[PDB]
Design a protein around this ligand. Structure first.
Ligand SMILES: *[C@@H]1O[C@H](CO)[C@@H](O)[C@H](O)[C@H]1NC(C)=O
Ligand SMILES: *[C@@H]1O[C@H](CO)[C@@H](O)[C@H](O)[C@H]1NC(C)=O
Lengths: 449, 107, 116, 449, 449, 107, 116, 107, 116
C-alpha cells in the first residue's frame, strides 16, 4: 500500500512504483465429473400436473445430455502466438483413451475428491461437484415406475428442478461458448469448490493464500474445457492457473506525446515513447506486458500473464531513469500531429496541450485551479478531481500515494526539425540518431561537392 | 506389460482362521486393483472395487490393502462360502493381466 | 440389474469357423465398450481386447491377433466374436465383459471345445 | 429522418449528413442500496421438504453475502488513456469513510429514494431498489424460530426464492465480472428504476426525454461498480452517463483505397484517406471519434462518447468538401497493394475493383444490373440489394435517403508514380508533397551535377 | 483427419495442410414469431398467495412486452467494411409494412412452420417457436375472471413461470444487447428448432448435414435481430448463415521473425512474413482470412467467413513453396528488434531465440530434451510437451499428424545489413529489392562523383 | 393492382346439390385468399382464413382449394342458410380488390 | 368478442360535409390499424385505405384521394372518417374493418345517402 | 468542528402546554440531527432518527422540524414522562458534537 | 433486541490505570464499529472516538488523544477502553455506542471516579 509515482518532464512519462506481482507462469488442469443417469423409458400413463412437470424436467435433462454429446463430438505485435487450452486439450485426449474414465470413476467412489495419476505420467486432481444420478434414480425412478406415476407432494418437483438447473446452465454455457468457457462461471465451479481445489494443488502455502484471497482474478484467468461423456459420466477440465512468481516489484509506465510548441500547424515535430505498460520482475530479468490490459490490478498486486509478455533486462528501468543511457536503446515513435490529449495515470494525470486547444485542471469545490499552457504537463490527484482537455472531460483517480515531479528539459528541444525523421512506429533513439547522421552526411556531401 | 504374480499358488485353511493373499505387481499400479473369486464353474465375481474400498454386496470379512507394488487381500474368517479360486488383476493400463490364481481348499 | 447373457456351448472341428455372441441388457449399450476375456483349462485368465460400441473399431491383445474378429449390432444391443480357423489350442471358455466401477462384469461362459 | 449521402469520386469517400448527436461528456454516480439481514443460527431440528428448501435458500443467501464481501475486499492510436470508473471508485472510497453509510441509511428510511450530500461536498442520489431484510426477518424468522420449523404452505418458499434470485444474480454478475459490470443489466437496475433515476437527475427536460427514450443505449454506456457491505446493507454505485451536447449535426465519413488502374501488378500506387469515422459538433469545434464503434447509432441520433474522441476545427468538414484546401492538412495513407474491397455505407456502397477481380452490383428480382470496371465506384441503395466483390458477397443497407454523386478526377492521377512515397500510415498531403519535392530536389541535384 | 505440417527454415514458417472448408458466403433470414396476449385488467379482489404469485408473473409478462416495444421503437487493415445485419434490417423494414404481419399470422395458423413469400419477392421461412397466448388466455383468464380469483392448485403458477421464463430471458438478452443478439442463444432458438430450421432451408443435402453436425458453430456465426411487436405478435429475425463453399483444401500459415544472430545489440536486422492466417480455396481463387480468429476450427474443418477475407490467386501457395518466385510478391516486414518468442503451431512449435535469451524444449517425463541456439528453429509435438522461451512457458498441442522439416538457408543471410531497409509493415520482396537498388544507386553515384 | 374476377356471376341451385365457385387472380397471390358471404343486408362475414384452412364457427361443407391464380370455394351441400352473395378478396398486397360477386338463389 | 360498432344512418345534401365514426372494443385499439371499405348499391365492394392507430398517418386508395379524410381519438378508442363535399355518387354503405388472422372484421354499415 | 448551541438552556412548563426547543448549527448539516432525552440517571435515549422522521416507539407529540442551520423539537403536550434533559447532536461529519443541554422541569 | 452491556462502577486513585469493557450482543459484532462517548458531571456529553471492529484500527478526538486506548476481542464479541494515568479530571461516566439508523445506541454507564 506504498504506491508512489514519478513524472519525468524530460520525456513526459510517469512511473508508478509500489506494486507487487502474481505472474501466471503455468497451468494446472483439474477434472470435474458429474455422475449422470440413464433415463429408461418412463412407461407410465397419466398426466397429472406434478407428473407432467417431472416429465418436462426429465425431457430437459435428456436434452441437455444430448446437446452435450453433440458438443463433444504500442508494442503488442511482438508477443508471439500460443495455444491457451493446449493442456486441457491434451488432458481431454488422454481421458478419451479406453480405461482412463474407469479409473477416475473408481477413484471418486466413496469420497468426492481424489488425485488420479493418468497413464501418461501426469497426476490430475479429479473432483465430483454434482451427484445427479443418485437423486434421479433413488428418488424419482421408483415413484415413476411402481405406482404408475402417482406423485404425492409438490416439493419433489421443485427439488428436482433446483438440482437440474446447474446442469442445464452448464449445458447452456457450453452450447453458447462452443465448449470452451472463460471465465469459469459459478455454475461450472462454485466458490467453495474453487477453494477446495486451491487448497489441494501442489503449491506453496503463500500461493494457496494468494489464490484464496483473489478467487475472482483466478476465475478471470482460467478456462473450462468440455471433455467427455462416456461410461455414464460427464467430465469437463478446468484449466486453473498457477503463479510461480509472487511478491516482486512491478512498475507501470504511462507515456504521452512530447511535441514542439511552435505557433503554426507546420514546422512542428512530436515524439512518444512506445514501451508503455506493466513491467515486472521474475527471475534476473524484467517481464514486459505491452498491452497493459493483459494484467488485472488489485489493491496493490498486479495479476499479469506471462503468455502475453516479453522478457527484457533491467536496462528497461535504466531507460525509465535516464533515456540517453548507452546500455539500452529506448523505444520512441515520431509524428508531426500536435494533438491534445491526457493520459490518466494512477496518482496523477499527464496533460499534453498543443495547438490552440484549451486545457484545464479543475477541482470540485473551487473550480478551475490550473490552466495548462503549450506543452505536456502533469498534476497530482491531491487538489485535482477532474481534468478537462479540449471538449473531453477526464476524471482522475483518488488513490492515495506520494506523487512526485522530476523537472527537466523536453528532449525534443535538441533535434533540429529540418532533419527529424517524422514517421515511425517501432523506432528508437539510436535508430533516429543514425537516420539524422546519414541525413547530415547527405547534406554535407551535397554542399561540399 | 505389467505382469502380476501371487505368492500362495496353493492354500489350505480351517473354517475359522484368518487367511491373507498377496499380489506383487511388476510395475507401479498406484492404487488400481481388484480381487475376483470363481466358484465351481461360474464367472469370476469381483470382491473389491479398488485396493481398499471393498464392493457392496460382499461380507465385511474381506479387507484389501496395499498401494503401488504390494497388495493384500485378507479373509478375516472362513466359511463354506469363502472357498474357490482367487485372482487379482490390475486395471491401470492395457493390456490387463491376472495373477496366477490362488486355490483355497479345506484344511 | 446389469446383465450380459452369452451364447450356448459348442463343439467344432479344427479348421472351422465359430461365432460366439453376447447380449447386453440393463444399460445403454452405447455407453461402455465391451471387452472379451479368454479362460483356459488349468491356465490363467487372459484378456484379449475390446471393441468400441460407437464406431465398432476393435483392438486386440498381442496374443490374440490375426484371426479373432470382434463385431456388434448396435440396434440389437449385442456384440459377438468370431474365431476363424479353429485349432486344438483355441479350446476353453470365452467371456464378454464391460467396465464396472473398478472391476469387470462377467457373463456366463461359452465352453468352445475343438476336437476331431 | 432527413439522412442523405454524398459520394466524392475525386477522393473515393462518402459522407452521410442527416444525423444528430448525444455526446457523453460527464458521469453521474448514483448509489443503489439493498437492506441485508443478519442470519442468526436457525436453531431448529426437523427436515421437512419445505423447511429443507427454505434452509437451502438461506444457505444460498448467506453464500451470496460472503462472496460479495470477498468481492469488495485508422486513427485510434491518438485517443489518450482515461480511467472509466474513476468517479465510481472515488464515490466508493468516500462511502468507505466512517459515518457516510449511517447517513445514507437514515435518508432512505421512510422513502425509497433520497438525495444525500456526502461529506466532501458532492450530492449523490441514493436509491433502495430491493428490501430483503424486511421479508426475511418478518416472514421467515418467526416461522423458523417459534414453532420449531413447522411450515404450513408451499407458497412461502417460492416467494422467498423469487425474492432472492435477484440478489443471487447480482452476486453472480459481480463474481464473474470482478466487481465491475458493464453494461448495467436488468438485475442491477431494472427499467422502471432506471427511469425513476433519470427523472431525478439534475439535467434539463430535453436530456431527461432523450435518456428516457433510449434506455438501452444508456445501459450500454454506463458501469455498475460494487462498493461496500457494511452496517448491514449492500451498496453498489451505478455510474450513469450524462450528455451535455445534444441535437447538433454529425456526419460519418466512409473512406476507401483509390489506386491507379494500370494493367500489371507493379507500377501502381494506392491512396487512402485515414480520417474515417463519426464527426460531430459540440461547442465551436468538431469532435472526432476515430473508431466508429465507440458511437452507437439509433434511428437518427449518434450516441457517441467524448472519452474516445479528438477535438478538431471545422476545417475537417472543409477537407470533406475540398481536399487541397490550404486551411487544413487532410490525412491520407499510401500503399502499393491493389486489393479489391467495398465499404458498405449507409445509403450506398463504395466498390473498389482493381487488378483482375470481378466485381458486380446485383439486384434481387432482375440479377446483376452493373459490372464495375477498374477503379473505385459507388452505387446507391435504390436499385441495388447486394454487392458482390470477388468471392465476398456484400449486402447493402435499405435505409431511405437522398444519395448523391459528385463526379471528379481521382487525385492519384496527379502523382507521377516514380516519386510517390508508397509507405505511410499517418501521412498527409503537405507531408507527401514535401517528400515529393525533396525527392525531385535530389533528382535535380543529381542530374545537374 | 490427415492433418500434416511443413516447417520451412528458409523463411521460418509452418504450413498445416490437411484441412477442409465451410466458408460463409451468404445469409438466410428466417422469422421467428411468438403469439402474445392482451392482458385485460384483472378485475378481481383477493390477495391469496397463489393469486399474488400469478399477478406478479403477469406483471413481469406485461413489463417484458413493454420493454420489447421500447426496444423496437498483420494484414487485417485491408478487409473493407460491411454491414452484418443488413439483410435482417431489410427484412424488418419489410415486415413493418402494412399487411406483411397479417399474411405471416395467417400462414402459421394450423401448423407451427411455413414459408411465406413477402411482397417484395423474397421467400422467408417463418416459424412459431412459442405459443403463450394460448396458455395465458385459455388457462389463466377464466380462473382469474369468473371465480373472483380463487386458484385451487399450486402447479399452475409453476407452469406459468416455466412458460414465461423463456420470454423473460429473450427480453433480458434484447435489453442488454440493444436488440441485436449474437451468438444466437438457446433461449432465442433452441437446438431442436435450429435443426428444424436447417432441415427446411433451400440448400443441398451436404450443407444440411454439415450445418446439423456443427450447430454450435452455426450459433456462433449468426445474429438475432429484434423486429416488431404489432397485431398481437412478437417477431424477431434470425440471420442464419449459409456456406456455399464446402470441402476444399485450406492451409494455415504460421510466421515468425527471422533475425540475424550477431552477438551485439546493433548491426542486426530482422524479417517477418506478414501474410499469416487461414487460406482457403473457393472458386478458382484463394480466399485469405488475415486475422485467423475470424475462422473457427473443428476436428478437421475450418468455419471461415468471407466477409472478413481477401481474394487472391494460387500464387499465394506459390509463395508458400518458394518465396523468390516471379509470379507473386510475397509480403514481408522488417525490423531491428531481436526479441525472443515462439509461435505455437498445430503440430509443432516455431521457436525464435535471439540475443542472450535461454530457450528450451522440455518433455514431461524426462525434462529438457533440447536447447535452442541463436536462430529460429522448430520442434514437432512427438517428443515435446512444453516449450520454454525466456520466462514464458509455452505448451504444445497434442494433435496427431505427420510433421515435416524442410531445411534451407535463412534468406536474411543474403541482405547486406548496411542497406537493409529496416522499418516496414506492408512491404514485400520486390519493394525491398527496389529500395536496396536505389540505395546502391545513391552509393555508386556518390562514390563515382 | 391485382384484379380478381369470378366465373359464375349468377347462380341457382337446389337444397341438396354441391355447388362450386371460382376466382381467377390477375397475379400470383401465392396462397392468400378469403371468401365472405353477405346475408340480406348484413356485413360480409368471412368463411375461410385462407385458400384452404377454413375459419372456425362455419359448417364443414365449405371447402376451399387453390393456389397462385386459380381458387375454388365448394359448398358441399346447400341449406336455407347457405344463400346470399359470395365475394372473394386477396390480401397479399395493397390495394385490396374483390370479386364481382356471386349471387346464389334457389333453383 | 371483438366488436366494431359504427354510427347510425344519415341523410345529407350534395355539397355538405359528413363524419362517420367507428367505435372499436374488445382489443387493444393501438394494435391493429383500422381499414375503411366502401360498398355501393349494385356495384362491388371497394377498399379505400387505412389509418395507423399509433401515429395517425393515413393512406388512401387512388380512387378515394382528395376529399376523404381519416382520423381517430386514441384515448376514446374510436376512429372516424370525414367525406367533404358530398356528391350524388358518394351514396352507399361505408365499412370500418381491421385485420383478423386472414380476412377482415366488418362492423355494421352506415347507409349515407346524398339526395337533394 | 461544527459546534451546536441550544437557545433554552433552562426551561419550565405545565402539564398541558406545548413547548419547543431549538438548536443552531455552526455549519450546514443539511438534514442530519437527532434529539436524545436523558432521564434521572439513565443513558440518553433518542427520540428521532432524523430532523423530521421521528423514531418508532416514542409518542407522537414529539415533532421535529428544520434543515441546514435551524432545527426545532416540539413537545406537543407535556406529561410526567416528558421530563428530563434534552440534547441534540449532528451526525453529518466527525467529530460529533452535542448541544448545551435543555433541562425541563415542572412549572 | 440490540444490547450493549457495560462494566460496573469503579473507584481508583490519580495515576493508576483502568480498563472499562463493553459487551455487545444482538447483532453481528463485526458489522458496526463501536463508538465511545464520555459524559461529565454538570458538563455536556463528549464524543471521543471509535474503533473499527474488523481491523481494530482506532481513531480519537483531539480532546482525547495521548492516553486513551481502544481495544476489542472479536471472538468474545466485546470491546473495551483503557485510560492510562488517571487524573482527577477523568471522572465521570463513559459510554459505548454504535450507529443506529440515525442516532446512537447507548449502554448503561460506568461511573469512574478518581479520588485520593
Ligand atoms: C551521429 O554520430 C554517431 C553515429 O553512430 C552517433 O553518436 C549518433 O548516431 C549521432 N550523434 C549525434 C546525433 O549526436
Ligand atoms: C535490383 O535490380 C532490379 C531492380 O528492379 C531487380 O532485380 C531487383 O530489385 C534488384 N536485384 C537484386 C537486389 O538482386
Amino acid at each position: 500500500q506504498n504506491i508512489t509515482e514519478e513524472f519525468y518532464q524530460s520525456t513526459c512519462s510517469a512511473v508508478s512504483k509500489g506494486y507487487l506481482s502474481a505472474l501466471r507462469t503455468g497451468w494446472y488442469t483439474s477434472v470435474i465429473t458429474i455422475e449422470l443417469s440413464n433415463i429408461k423409458e418412463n412407461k407410465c400413463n397419466g398426466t397429472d400436473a406434478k407428473v407432467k412437470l417431472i416429465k418436462q424436467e426429465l425431457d430437459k435433462y435428456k436434452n441437455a445430455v444430448t446437446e452435450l454429446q453433440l458438443l463433444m463430438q504500442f508494442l503488442g505485435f511482438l508477443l508471439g502466438v500460443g495455444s491457451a487450452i493446449a493442456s486441457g486439450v491434451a488432458v481431454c485426449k488422454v481421458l478419451h483413451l479406453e480405461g482412463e474414465v474407469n479409473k477416475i470413476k473408481s477413484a471418486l467412489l466413496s469420497t468426492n475428491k481424489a488425485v488420479v495419476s493418468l497413464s501418461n505420467g501426469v497426476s490430475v486432481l479429479t473432483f465430483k461437484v454434482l451427484d445427479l444420478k443418485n437423486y434421479i434414480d433413488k428418488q424419482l425412478l421408483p415413484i415413476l415406475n411402481k405406482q404408475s406415476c402417482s406423485i404425492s407432494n409438490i416439493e419433489t418437483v421443485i427439488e428436482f428442478q433446483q438440482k437440474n438447473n446447474r446442469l442445464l446452465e452448464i449445458t447452456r454455457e457450453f452450447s453458447v461458448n462452443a465448449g470452451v468457457t472463460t471465465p469459469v462461471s459459478t455454475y461450472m465451479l462454485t466458490n467453495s469448490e474453487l477453494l477446495s481445489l486451491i487448497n489441494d494443488m501442489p503449491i506453496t502455502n503463500d500461493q494457496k493464500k494468494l489464490m484464496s484471497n483473489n478467487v475472482q482474478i483466478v476465475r478471470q484467468q482460467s478456462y473450462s474445457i468440455m471433455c467427455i461423456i462416456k461410461e455414464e459420466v460427464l467430465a469437463y477440465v478446468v484449466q486453473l492457473p498457477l503463479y510461480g512468481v509472487i511478491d516482486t516489484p512491478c512498475w507501470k509506465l504511462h507515456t504521452s506525446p512530447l511535441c514542439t510548441t511552435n505557433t503554426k500547424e507546420g514546422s512542428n515535430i512530436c515524439l512518444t515513447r512506445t514501451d508503455r505498460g506493466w513491467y515486472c520482475d521474475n527471475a534476473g530479468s524484467v517481464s514486459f506486458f505491452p498491452q497493459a490490459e493483459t494484467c488485472k490490478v488489485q489493491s496493490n498486486r498486479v495479476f499479469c500473464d506471462t503468455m502475453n509478455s516479453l522478457t527484457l533486462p533491467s536496462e528497461v528501468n535504466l531507460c525509465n531513469v535516464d533515456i540517453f543511457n548507452p546500455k539500452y536503446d529506448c523505444k520512441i515513435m515520431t509524428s508531426k500531429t500536435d494533438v491534445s490529449s491526457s493520459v490518466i495515470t494512477s496518482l496523477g494525470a499527464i496533460v499534453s496541450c498543443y495547438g490552440k486547444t484549451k486545457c484545464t485542471a479543475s477541482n470540485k469545490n473551487r473550480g478551475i485551479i490550473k490552466t495548462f499552457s503549450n506543452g505536456c504537463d502533469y498534476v497530482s490527484n491531491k487538489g485535482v478531481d477532474t481534468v478537462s482537455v479540449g471538449n473531453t472531460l477526464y476524471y482522475v483517480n483518488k488513490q492515495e500515494g506520494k506523487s512526485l515531479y522530476v523537472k527537466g528539459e523536453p528532449i525534443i528541444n535538441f533535434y533540429d526539425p529540418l532533419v527529424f525523421p517524422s514517421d515511425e512506429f517501432d523506432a528508437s533513439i539510436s535508430q533516429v540518431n543514425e537516420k539524422i547522421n546519414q541525413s547530415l552526411a547527405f547534406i554535407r556531401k551535397s554542399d561540399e561537392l | 506389460d505389467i505382469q502380476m504374480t501371487q505368492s500362495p499358488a496353493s492354500l489350505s485353511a480351517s473354517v475359522g482362521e484368518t487367511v491373507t493373499i498377496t499380489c506383487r505387481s511388476s510395475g507401479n499400479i498406484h492404487n488400481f486393483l481388484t480381487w475376483y473369486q470363481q466358484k465351481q464353474g461360474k464367472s469370476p465375481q469381483f470382491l473389491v472395487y479398488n485396493a481398499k474400498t471393498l464392493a457392496d454386496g460382499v461380507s465385511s470379512r474381506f479387507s484389501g490393502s496395499g498401494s503401488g507394488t504390494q497388495f493384500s487381500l485378507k479373509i478375516n474368517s472362513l466359511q463354506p462360502e469363502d472357498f474357490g479360486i482367487y485372482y487379482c488383476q490390475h486395471f491401470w493400463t492395457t493390456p490387463y493381466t491376472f495373477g496366477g490364481g490362488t486355490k483355497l481348499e479345506i484344511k | 440389474q446389469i446383465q450380459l447373457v452369452q451364447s450356448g456351448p459348442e463343439l467344432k472341428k479344427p479348421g472351422e469357423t465359430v461365432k460366439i455372441s453376447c447380449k447386453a441388457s440393463g444399460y445403454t449399450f452405447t455407453d461402455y465398450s465391451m471387452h472379451w476375456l479368454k479362460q483356459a483349462p488349468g491356465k490363467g485368465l487372459k484378456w484379449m481386447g475390446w471393441i468400441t460400441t460407437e464406431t465398432g473399431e476393435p483392438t486386440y491383445a498381442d496374443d490374440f491377433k490375426g484371426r479373432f474378429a470382434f463385431s456388434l449390432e448396435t440396434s440389437a444391443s449385442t456384440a459377438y466374436l468370431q474365431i476363424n480357423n479353429l485349432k486344438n489350442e483355441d479350446t476353453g471358455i470365452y467371456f464378454c465383459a464391460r467396465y464396472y466401477y473398478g472391476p469387470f462384469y462377467w457373463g456366463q461362459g461359452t465352453l468352445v471345445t475343438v476336437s476331431t
